[PDB]
Design a protein around this nucleic acid. Structure first.
Ligand SMILES: [Mg+2]
Ligand SMILES: [Mg+2]
Ligand SMILES: [Mg+2]
Ligand SMILES: [Mg+2]
Ligand SMILES: [Mg+2]
Ligand SMILES: [Mg+2]
Ligand SMILES: [Mg+2]
Ligand SMILES: [Mg+2]
Ligand SMILES: [Mg+2]
Ligand SMILES: [Mg+2]
Ligand SMILES: [Mg+2]
Ligand SMILES: [Mg+2]
Ligand SMILES: [Mg+2]
Ligand SMILES: [Mg+2]
Lengths: 57, 188, 260
RNA sequence: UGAAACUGCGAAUGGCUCAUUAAAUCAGUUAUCGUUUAUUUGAUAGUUCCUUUACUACAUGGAUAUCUGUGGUAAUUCUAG
RNA sequence: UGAUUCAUAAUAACUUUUCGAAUCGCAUGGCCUUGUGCUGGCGAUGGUUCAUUCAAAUUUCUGCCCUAUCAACUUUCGAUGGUAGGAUAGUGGCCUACCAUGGUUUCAACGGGUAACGGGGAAUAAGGGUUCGAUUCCGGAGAGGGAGCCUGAGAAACGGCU
RNA sequence: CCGUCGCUAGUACCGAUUGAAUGGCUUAGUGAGGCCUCAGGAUUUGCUUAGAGAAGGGGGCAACUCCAUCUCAGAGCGAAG
């Protein structure tokens, strides 16, 4: 589904709509307040590090 | 919820007073504190007119006072020795007002060693004179001495720790003390 | 109900306002001040119904804002500030200095007082206690608390307060044969001498008081205020001078004095 | 000058209605030496130090909202980063 | 003070040491040890217990409509009192423990009914009365019912919540 | 003029239905929800001198003529939660 990605220092952030389910499947059964890698999330993100905090059902 | 209404309480005669109005806040009474002795804990409660009202919880320590000497100290409590309202407060060991307790006593001893300096249980030249001037004033009523020796002074706590927060009390002397001792003996 | 009441309905409004039964739902609730609700007088009632310097509430408010009004030295801006018995209202434009003093009937008379007298305030003694740091202080039934009063200033005495400074000029001891002014009920507004003091343990000290006409009356002690020594009152009292005539007498006075 | 928002205070007044409620409410009458009381006007705090030969003051700290941005939801005076 | 263990002031300690202006608008004075030095006005708000005022809970005394086809009731499950505690802003069986057996009643207790919220008052109107009072004022209750609580000086709030 | 027995209407009375309904009390069992309470510790940080890369990281090679220094592995000690 959608993702809600934001960079701190630059102050620049974006919509990343994800219909492909495999990509989504990285975050399943994690909890708010954890770390994530870039490469498994998608092909556009590689080398990056997400920090999982916040979401919505 | 827990109220202090005379609305309920049937009547002087007996007629069942019907529930006139839903009970008010100004009529309220809070849940009991029943402070034990096991780590120092306090929670305030915002009362009527604001006004915080410290509830002792598991209170250790408190300034228990002499009468004869006219003193009190940063002194620890040991246990609830005899509470004259209810003995359930001795099993559970819930410290309260006018419950008889045993006092750490070391602090008291130390103070005495400064005050008179003759020791209970069994330097410098002008201070000697002072010492001489003092002492042989209070001989102490035997039981108290024994308690001191033990490390466990018999007091009755007289601060209400559920209201005040502090657990300050009174070293027992004379007739009342004797009575308390007797009661304790009877119990045991 | 549920806390402090904030309105005053116009019928429930105290009668010595002399308000209209009609002309609005409410009356001005005199706010928290130095005088008791019913024994007070708000600055609306004074500047609208009595003086008529303001045609309405808004006008009164405006006047207050302008700050020509001064009730007892200080300025005031509150429409419903309870200016009570003995309070000195000075309007600086006009120079119409007033002291709030009662009429023989009971209602507050508009006493157009001089500038030299409107300067001090005579005030009663409610208490004599000591506060913190062992300092003796007197309290007045007319608002103030004054630290350090002459040791022989006891309860129910009267005290000339300098007002500007808020100190003590002088005092009168409450006793037999000393001019007294009445502030309670059926005798409210009269003036007399003091004859007796029925002691009574707890239940209200009475005072048998005769006026200039040798007409006796009785009041409770709390309802009496010591105004001077017989002949020399410390304040200028209004026309009538606390006599309070009989009804017939009053009628006669009215219908004798026809001067067109 | 000032939207917004945090702080303040207000929302316990007023208005309505008479269901309960029969020594209860209520009326006058007392008392609080039996108490709380924002507001009110009056009052008012050299002692915070902790041995006393080199120490925070002409101004101490990091947050959070507006915003701006990344959003979810079929919806709600919804609010996550 | 009618009256106190009152006001209040000392001695003794404790204290998860409250408070003790790192606050905003105008105005911009006084001495030179000539530094930008030390100093000082008109106000706002806070903040301590004591006053006061607005109030607040209780509380004294006396007073309610019909009913005996309600004569006993209260007291296991607080009734009455005591002692102690707990709680409360505080008094108090308000609650707890232990003990005593009280407490009310034909001067109608208790129960039942009210098409009863109380009073000011209203109608009638010789005197005495009789009936009515939901309703402009004062009190009291309630916010569909019953419960519980947050915030707050003040609510057991319902144009607050559970 | 009084009763019984007739006819036509209506009022109440008793009355099986294991009647039905509403409310008030109420046994036993359950028991929502808050308040306190025993813990519990998502998170937020201060102070520790705890080693940096820092280009005068305190007024000129140097424990910077080392600055609330560049700032995270500290970890200890808290406070709120
Ligand atoms: Mg207060
Ligand atoms: Mg009295
Ligand atoms: Mg109302
Ligand atoms: Mg005292
Ligand atoms: Mg008691
Ligand atoms: Mg009636
Ligand atoms: Mg009714
Ligand atoms: Mg009525
Ligand atoms: Mg009705
Ligand atoms: Mg009403
Ligand atoms: Mg309805
Ligand atoms: Mg409610
Ligand atoms: Mg509504
Ligand atoms: Mg309302």
């Amino acid at each position: 589904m959608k993702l809600n990605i934001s960079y701190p220092i630059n102050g620049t952030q974006k919509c990343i709509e994800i219909d492909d389910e495999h990509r989504v499947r990285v975050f399943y059964d994690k909890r708010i307040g954890q770390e994530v890698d870039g490469e498994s999330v998608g092909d556009e993100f590689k080398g990056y590090v997400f920090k999982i905090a916040g979401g919505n059902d | 919820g827990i109220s202090r209404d005379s609305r309920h309480k049937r009547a002087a005669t007996g007629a069942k007073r019907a529930q006139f109005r839903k009970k008010r806040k100004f009529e309220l009474g809070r849940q009991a504190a029943n402070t034990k002795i096991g780590t120092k804990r306090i929670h305030p409660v915002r009362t009527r007119g604001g006004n915080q009202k410290f509830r002792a919880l598991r209170i250790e320590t408190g300034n228990f006072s002499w009468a004869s000497e006219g003193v009190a100290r940063k002194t620890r409590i040991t246990g609830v020795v005899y509470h004259p309202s209810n003995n359930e407060l001795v099993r559970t060991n819930t410290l309260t007002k006018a419950a008889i307790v045993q006092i750490d006593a070391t602090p008291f001893r130390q103070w005495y060693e400064s005050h008179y300096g003759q020791s209970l249980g069994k330097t410098s030249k002008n201070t000697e004179r002072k010492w001489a001037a003092r002492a042989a004033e209070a001989k102490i009523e035997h039981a108290v001495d024994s308690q001191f020796g033990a490390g466990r002074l018999y007091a009755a706590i007289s601060s209400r720790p559920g209201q005040s927060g502090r657990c300050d009390g009174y070293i027992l002397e004379g007739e009342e003390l004797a009575f308390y001792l007797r009661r304790l003996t009877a119990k045991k | 109900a549920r806390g402090p009441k904030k309105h005053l309905k116009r019928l429930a409004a105290p009668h010595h306002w002399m308000l209209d039964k009609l002309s609005g739902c409410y009356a001005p609730r005199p706010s928290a001040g130095p005088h008791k609700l019913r024994e007070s007088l708000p600055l609306i009632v004074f500047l609208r119904n009595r003086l008529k310097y303001a045609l309405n509430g808004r006008e009164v408010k405006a006047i207050l804002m302008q700050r020509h009004v001064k009730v007892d030295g200080k300025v005031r801006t509150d429409t419903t500030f309870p200016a009570g018995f003995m309070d000195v209202i000075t309007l600086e434009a006009t120079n119409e200095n007033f002291r709030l003093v009662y009429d023989v009937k009971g209602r507050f008379a508009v006493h157009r007082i001089t500038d030299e007298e409107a300067s001090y305030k005579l005030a009663k003694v409610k208490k004599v206690q000591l506060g913190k740091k062992g300092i003796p202080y007197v309290v007045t039934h007319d608002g103030r608390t004054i630290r350090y009063p002459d040791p022989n200033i006891k309860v129910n005495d009267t005290v000339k307060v300098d007002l500007a400074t808020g100190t003590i000029t002088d005092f009168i001891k409450f006793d037999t044969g000393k001019l007294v002014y009445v502030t309670g009920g059926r005798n409210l507004g009269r003036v007399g001498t003091i004859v007796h003091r029925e002691r009574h343990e707890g239940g209200f000290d009475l005072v048998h008081i005769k006026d200039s006409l040798e007409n006796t009356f009785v009041t409770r002690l709390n309802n009496v205020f010591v105004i001077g020594e017989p002949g020399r009152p410390w304040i200028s009292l209004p026309k009538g001078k606390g006599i309070k005539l009989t009804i017939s007498e009053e009628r006669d006075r009215r219908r004798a004095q026809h001067g067109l």
